[PDB]
From Swiss-Prot, chains A, B:
Organism of provenance: Homo sapiens
Region (Required for translocation to the plasma membrane in response to insulin): 2-102
Tissue: Expressed in brain, colon, heart, kidney, liver, lung, megakaryocyte, ovary, pancreas, peripheral blood lymphocytes, placenta, prostate, skeletal muscle, small intestine, spleen, testis, thymus and trachea.
Superkingdom of origin organism: Eukaryota
PTM comment: Tyrosine phosphorylated. Also phosphorylated by PKA.
Function: Required for translocation of GLUT4 to the plasma membrane in response to insulin signaling. Required to coordinate membrane tubulation with reorganization of the actin cytoskeleton during endocytosis. Binds to lipids such as phosphatidylinositol 4,5-bisphosphate and phosphatidylserine and promotes membrane invagination and the formation of tubules. Also promotes CDC42-induced actin polymerization by recruiting WASL/N-WASP which in turn activates the Arp2/3 complex. Actin polymerization may promote the fission of membrane tubules to form endocytic vesicles.
Protein name: Cdc42-interacting protein 4
Length: 273, 273
């Protein structure tokens, strides 16, 4: 009974494993689609004038957003490897080890069942043999009481009875031996054989569970790894914004252009006379 | 000259403003599409068995990922407000203030140009008036030298000359006054009038530049604001993974099910005889 339960439960353990793997695969894809659009966006507004801080910082910011997208691709990459690829391989291993333990258990059950079939046939053969001996005893008996039967009639019927009696005895002994044989095997089957199989499944199940736990961890671990650089990115944007020097951009304007500011002097008198 | 340059430059300042606004709007949309898929994902694997830590932590993790999506929506929300909405309104204000300063400048140029047209007409009228006086002087002169002309011929032609001479003098004075008038205005135009307009455009431009700088800042500021909760989210996932107690889940299994583990005893002997 504890066999069918472990069977459904260990299968459930692999199913959950396979779902987590599936959940991370999609997380990976969702993450990548995002980074993609982030790249595209940066492409769309980046320079196809660039002397003023205003136009400068905007580039520096587009740059850090572009780096940020890089970090997200890094997470999608690591998860895809440390989790999906690895755990998918590991789920295949455990799916197989599980199969092996159950085959060993089934073989154990089959060996005992075959023992039971032996028990059965010997009991049956004992029963029928008992009936014959009884039917042959009733016959010999009745003639024995028939004062008109001959001594030969009694002798013959008695022979058949003694004969069937011995056969029932022999059949009884094989039934008995078989019973003793079966009971020991069954006892041993439940005392050590099944417990030993249960241990293996408990061991494997616990290993998958622990490994599934580490898989859970890789989800947050991949995020944590990129935390520092994402912080670098954010700072890079904060400095860029504070780099915008409005009063100085003005200075730069009335500079490269001033050489064209002509201040016309007084118009002259046109004496025609 | 410095007018047309400031004209193109201040327009460029508003254009860059409008591009940043545009860049953030899309960032907002890219961010939202991401959070959406993140929500959908969590929906897809969340519970439509839940007694084992393994199934537990997975939910707790799906929960924190779901919260994470919330934080991203929060950023998309804030940017959409503090940047897009606000700066779009502000770009409209500055587009209008800019228009106003240039109209004031154009009016200044038109007033001077109209002054020049006055100068011109007076010069022209002086020139033609000079020629007449000259043509009339050559006529009076020639008759004056003609010993066969009469005194009347000379007198008449001289009258016409003196007359045209006075008209040329009067026209000269109006040309002169006009010149003095124009030169002062032009001088004043370039000394104070245009400088005063330039200041206003410099002031406005610098204000848009500074404001555009703050807009740049809101990009990183919105990220920083959610940094703490995103950290909470990551921790929530790390604990969940470390909460997976494999050895204890086993315990929970051979519990709610054990009441069904029947250990069959010895089969009994069937004495038929």
């Amino acid at each position: 009974g504890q066999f069918e339960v472990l069977e459904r439960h260990t299968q459930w353990g692999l199913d959950l494993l396979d779902r987590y793997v599936k959940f991370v695969k999609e997380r990976t894809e969702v993450e990548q689609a995002y980074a993609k659009q982030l790249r595209s966006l940066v492409k769309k507004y980046l320079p196809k004038e660039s002397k003023f801080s205003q136009q400068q910082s905007f580039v520096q910011i587009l740059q850090e957003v572009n780096d940020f997208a890089g970090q997200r691709e890094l997470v999608a990459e690591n998860l895809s490897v440390r989790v999906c690829l690895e755990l998918t391989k590991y789920s295949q291993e455990m799916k197989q080890e599980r199969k092996m333990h159950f085959q060993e258990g089934r073989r154990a059950q089959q060996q005992l069942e075959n023992g039971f079939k032996q028990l059965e046939n010997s009991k049956r053969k004992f029963e029928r043999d008992c009936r014959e001996a009884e039917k042959a005893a009733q016959t010999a008996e009745r003639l024995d009481q028939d004062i008109n039967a001959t001594k030969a009639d009694v002798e013959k019927a008695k022979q058949q009875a003694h004969l069937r009696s011995h056969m029932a005895e022999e059949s009884k002994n094989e039934y008995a031996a078989q019973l003793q044989r079966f009971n020991r095997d069954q006892a041993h089957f439940y005392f050590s054989q099944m417990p030993q199989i249960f241990d293996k499944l408990q061991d494997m199940d616990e290993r998958r569970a622990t490994r599934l736990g580490a898989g859970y961890g890789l989800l947050s671990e991949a995020e944590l790894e990129v935390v520092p650089i994402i912080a670098k990115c954010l700072e890079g944007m904060k400095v860029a914004a504070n780099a915008v020097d409005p009063k100085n951009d003005s200075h730069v304007l009335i500079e490269l252009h001033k050489s064209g500011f002509a201040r016309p002097g007084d118009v002259e008198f046109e004496d025609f006379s």
